[PDB]
Design a binder for this molecule. Sequence first.
Ligand SMILES: Cc1ccc(O)cc1
Ligand SMILES: Cc1ccc(O)cc1
Lengths: 346, 346
Amino acid sequence: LHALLRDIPAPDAEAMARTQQHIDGLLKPPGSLGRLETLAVQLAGMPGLNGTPQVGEKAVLVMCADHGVWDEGVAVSPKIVTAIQAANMTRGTTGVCVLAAQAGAKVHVIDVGIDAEPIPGVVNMRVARGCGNIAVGPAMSRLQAEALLLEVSRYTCDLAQRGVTLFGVGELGMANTTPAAAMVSVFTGSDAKEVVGIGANLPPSRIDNKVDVVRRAIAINQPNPRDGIDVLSKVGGFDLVGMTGVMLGAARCGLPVLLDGFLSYSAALAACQIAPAVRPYLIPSHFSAEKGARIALAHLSMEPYLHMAMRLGEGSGAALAMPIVEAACAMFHNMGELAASNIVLP
Amino acid sequence: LHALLRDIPAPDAEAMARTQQHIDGLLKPPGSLGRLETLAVQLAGMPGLNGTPQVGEKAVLVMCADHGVWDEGVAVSPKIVTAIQAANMTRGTTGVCVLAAQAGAKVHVIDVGIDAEPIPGVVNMRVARGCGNIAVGPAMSRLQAEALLLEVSRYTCDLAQRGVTLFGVGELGMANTTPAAAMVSVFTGSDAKEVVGIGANLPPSRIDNKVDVVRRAIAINQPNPRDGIDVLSKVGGFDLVGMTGVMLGAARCGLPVLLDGFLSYSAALAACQIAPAVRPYLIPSHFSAEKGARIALAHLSMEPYLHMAMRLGEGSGAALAMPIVEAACAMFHNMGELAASNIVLP
Ligand SMILES: Cc1ccc(O)cc1
Ligand SMILES: Cc1ccc(O)cc1
């Protein structure tokens, strides 16, 4: 794991320069394609991409797990929905499945800690039958966190070997917006009230209790903000840990990762805390409708492309932005050049 | 034309109710898919869609024309670029071509007034060899405007007959951000300085002159803000007129139109002024980086989905949002239902 972190590659400045120059000569006024140009150069700097913006196969990794904090009444969704939906992921009827198919991406469902019998068809990396209730203790042990990180990380890089060049990260876990808020608060030094949202339609009344639970989790565990692993293990979850693992693996493999929503931003904060080298590999998708979104995004210095008021999760936003990535590549590769049309601009 | 305007259909409230209800039973927390749900219901209300969100063939209509105001030094792009790029549109090397191909849409290049010899392969609907210099007079006659409106409108509906269900609107005309700003100012009652932008890399120095030209166009012509045709003919352009025509035709045909950037917002203001019934057919794409964008959008009460800092034009933003539209349809049609999984939410 030290190795892992040690070996994350830096972006290829040379490839990026070449990229920029090529983009500048395309059939348009310089800089006119805005963030599409910026995205393209960003991809060019990614070592697993072979010096040019390209997209091979696409995959969306969905990390599923249950949380003990559910017992604190912070979620109106029945706990069993995690297991139900996980099964549904195998049948292609879920939101992320539908959008991924639309984007030509494959969905990988991973059970990192569902509190139910194992589900056939789901990748089994289960740590436990749900994590500990962060309200009264840690979610898990540091060892457990590290091991899951390693395992997911590896799994991710392995896919790379099979032609995957673009990852999407997502989750599924009833009550997961609670640990997500706790992490955000901790990492950004924001107060709980400012980052605690409605999650999956939590009634307005119930908010206060959710805020209290978050505060308690923090007071009781005293996670160290300078230690991302410490934070994850204490007030995080298996699903949160697995998402961070995808980010770590993609980065190590020198490949791009598309973020999803709020939950994903939390995992991204942890990943960047653990290894800043991860940053350049992350690509935002949409601007989540969860209350704590703006703060979390400011801390990652990220500006999403999509404003859809989405808050479903599952990696649905990631799948939705995939076409944008492909767009930047198409632009890079298929547009004609100014010089070829004898067009000369000041 | 009175007929045309008279026959624009109202949205189908019945279809929309059915839509909403179906969306509500899908495999997700109610309202969790945000604007994707809203978009879907919006499409369901469109009469040419046959009571459900669907997308058949896609087309992007690019209206090309020159402007006399070019002579006022408001644009650094050589005037001939309009004609050059128009030809390029026929070869599939332009920005909109590349993105449309990515979206599976076909590009229709229409010459409404290029100041050059006719270009083979381009649809010929040329009014004149460039419009009048709005700085010292009207762009064209009212008759000319009406006729172009009619003709484009018809052309648009005709495509509908051939399986097209989703339109994209774009333009190509050196110096066109000038009449666009004039229109915006007029319709929104905003001062010129507030809506005049850099266009295609106009140098910061040159701005002042651009602002003056806009003011002059307005003072001299005295267009009537309550009369959209009056405004278009006076301080608009052939390209601006044609874009409005696409919007009018799509609406009459009861079909959706995806807007592009700043230029398209101007045409949309005119269209809504001329026929408010057009409104429900319009769908924003991206949030253009042109200075006057926010104001123009506020007046249309529209919030774009994409934040790409784009300012190329040509209908590039429209092509880029097409996949979003298809996403909303896929969601509507392919997701499973809560009840089927025995999932019960409060
Ligand atoms: C120089 C140029 C190229 C393309 C375009 O759409 C406008 C201007
Ligand atoms: C009820 C539900 C459905 C899907 C999902 O991802 C979360 C909760």
